């Protein structure tokens, strides 16, 4: 929801999300929904974004309407920040448990230490039920099961109220007598030495001694109970296992890419060389969370968000099968209302008019090839 505001070129060349899937579109309270997919870290990572040496797999959502039960990069849990390598592809999986009823736009996002939020595609997920039914049980290594919704809440309230009461008692003890104007006049007109006299000093000594003694006793009591404690577990996690993708058999060279100002279409001329041993056909162009599809070649069945999906938004001048070894140059047009709705056309405002994206090539059998393209994006006005 915070996207459509970030720079178009920055959204185009940071992280490309694809093969996204959602286990459910509509869930009950306490029910789990799983979000899977892959993200590729673009090689032309903008210099204004710090390299993803410290990155966190986050979820874009309006507060804890879901709780993040688990999150994985590769196949291992990532509750801390992780190190990503530029040019690598990683698979991810986030498990969410529904907590608050409503219709929520859930994004998978990557927060980068010195670059800010990189928001992936967002999907509307409906939660039904009551928040009062939500439970978040955890079992500790000390053998007790607690609900994270209300665990320690009473203790927190008690201690805060107790210390607030002590402070209020101190202030009220001094506030029984007149406060401001008579005391000011006594201090000014001559030596005061009369508004602070025993047993005021005795009360202050009692307050100080009781405060120190109560702090010490409470610490000792909180040590006898909960004798086993550990510090907060933190630290960036290295060694994220990237995907071992095969080298693509399709090479694409971008010769000029243009978009009309104003307009809802982006045009580029590609020289595609087909290696391997099967006729290929261009089926998809993904630029920034927006999938332009050639409906005659590929159809989306993963329930991709409709406002981000252009079913027939990709038109290839010659999308006939490309025989192996053959090289041809085609004009590719990616047109959809999403290009203006998600403010991809506002790259004219950007100080770096370069685009990046993913091309998906499909053969007759159905297996697909992912090739990455990047080029300057030249506006056209006349």
């Amino acid at each position: 929801h915070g996207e459509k505001s970030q720079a178009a070129f920055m959204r185009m060349r940071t992280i490309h999300w694809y093969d996204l899937s959602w286990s459910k579109e509509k869930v009950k309270i306490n029910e789990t929904v799983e979000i899977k997919g892959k993200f590729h870290v673009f090689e032309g990572w903008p210099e204004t974004v710090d390299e993803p040496d410290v990155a966190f797999l986050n979820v874009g959502m309006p507060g804890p309407v879901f709780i993040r039960k688990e999150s994985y990069i590769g196949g291992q849990l990532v509750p801390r920040s992780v190190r990503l390598e530029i040019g690598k592809t990683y698979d991810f999986r986030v498990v969410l448990k529904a907590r608050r009823p409503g219709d929520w736009h859930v994004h998978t996002m990557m927060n980068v230490q010195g670059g800010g939020p990189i928001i992936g595609p967002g999907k509307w997920i409906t939660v039904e039920g009551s928040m009062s039914e939500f439970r978040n049980p955890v079992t500790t290594l000390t053998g007790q099961t607690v609900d994270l919704e209300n665990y320690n809440e009473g203790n927190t309230y008690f201690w805060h109220a107790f210390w607030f009461a002590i402070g209020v008692a101190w202030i009220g003890y001094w506030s029984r007598r007149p406060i401001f104007i008579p005391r000011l006049l006594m201090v000014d007109a001559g030596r005061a030495d009369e508004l602070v006299s025993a047993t005021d000093r005795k009360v202050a000594m009692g307050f100080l001694a009781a405060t120190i003694l109560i702090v010490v006793m409470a610490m000792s009591s909180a040590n006898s109970k909960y004798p086993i404690t550990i510090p907060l577990q933190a630290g960036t996690m290295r060694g994220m296992k990237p995907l071992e993708l095969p080298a693509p058999t399709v090479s694409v060279k971008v010769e000029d890419a243009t978009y009309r100002v104003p307009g809802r279409a982006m045009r580029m001329k590609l020289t595609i060389t087909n290696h391997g041993n099967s006729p290929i056909r261009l089926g998809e162009f993904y630029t920034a969370s927006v999938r332009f599809l050639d409906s005659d070649v590929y159809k989306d069945t993963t329930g991709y968000p409709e406002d981000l999906l252009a079913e027939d938004g990709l038109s290839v001048s010659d999308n006939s099968p490309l025989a192996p070894g053959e090289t041809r140059t085609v004009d590719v047009t990616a047109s959809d209302a999403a290009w203006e709705v998600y403010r991809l056309s506002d790259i004219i405002y950007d100080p770096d008019s370069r685009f990046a994206g993913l091309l998906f090539f499909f053969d007759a059998t159905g297996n697909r090839q992912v090739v990455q393209i990047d080029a300057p994006l030249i506006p056209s006005f006349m």
Binding site: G2, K4, S5, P62, H105, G116, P182
Partner: protein, 236 residues
């Protein structure tokens, strides 16, 4: 008569208006207020911003101009009883200023903390800031300026000169509003994070310190209270 029921209104107007504002932002926080380029964001928060800015400018002009036009010309021939009454009215103004300062600099400022920590910053004019930077801050600025003008124009103690602590107490917290330029600049250029303790926020901190001039202001108002009707009783 002395202290009248203007104090009740002073508390109640801020309390009721800000409770309604909190209800409004609870209803339209999400759902017309998350997407800054969505059409309903314009009718529920941009319209709010426009209306509140216009009303703030108009109210400030009217209030300050009225207070300055009705200023007491013959302050010399003011009896101690009427001076005590005016001192109590000025104290009511200071109470309203303190209440507005609370609402602006504590409630809506930390409320904007939570909002910006739970959502992705989407614009410079988010629902939280609309309520904090451009409603609560102008409201307490208007109240503080009005209290200063009332003191200067009705209290002989605060006349014949500009009180330095009062000027600091009134203008420093005002400087938090132009400091929003540093906040927006420091959030879009500096610090691609949501750290609330980032040095881009030290503009609010430094000019929030100037509210400590309330101590000098209040001893000045105590002296103004204790001019003719200081007692006796007090030191007697």
């Amino acid at each position: 008569l002395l202290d009248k029921k203007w104090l009740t209104f002073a508390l109640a107007i801020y309390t009721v208006f800000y409770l309604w504002v909190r209800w409004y932002e609870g209803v339209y926080g999400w759902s017309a207020g998350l997407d800054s380029f969505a059409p309903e964001f314009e009718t529920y928060w941009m319209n709010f911003l426009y209306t509140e800015i216009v009303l703030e400018i108009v109210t400030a002009s009217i209030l300050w101009g009225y207070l300055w036009k009705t200023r007491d010309r013959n302050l010399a021939a003011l009896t101690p009883r009427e001076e005590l009454r005016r001192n109590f009215t000025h104290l009511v103004w200071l109470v309203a200023y303190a209440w507005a300062i609370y609402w602006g600099a504590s409630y809506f400022t930390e409320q904007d903390g939570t909002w910006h920590q739970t959502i992705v910053r989407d614009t410079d004019f988010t629902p939280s800031h609309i309520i904090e930077f451009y409603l609560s801050y102008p409201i307490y600025i208007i109240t503080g300026f009005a209290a200063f003008i009332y003191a200067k124009t009705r209290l002989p103690f605060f006349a014949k000169g500009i009180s330095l602590p009062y000027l600091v107490l009134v203008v420093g917290p005002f400087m938090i509003l132009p400091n929003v330029g540093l906040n927006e600049w420091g959030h879009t250029f500096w610090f691609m994070e949501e750290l609330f303790v980032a040095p881009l926020h030290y503009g609010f901190v430094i000019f929030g310190w100037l509210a400590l001039a309330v101590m000098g202001t209040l001893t000045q108002t105590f002296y103004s209270f204790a001019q003719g009707g200081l007692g006796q009783s007090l030191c007697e």
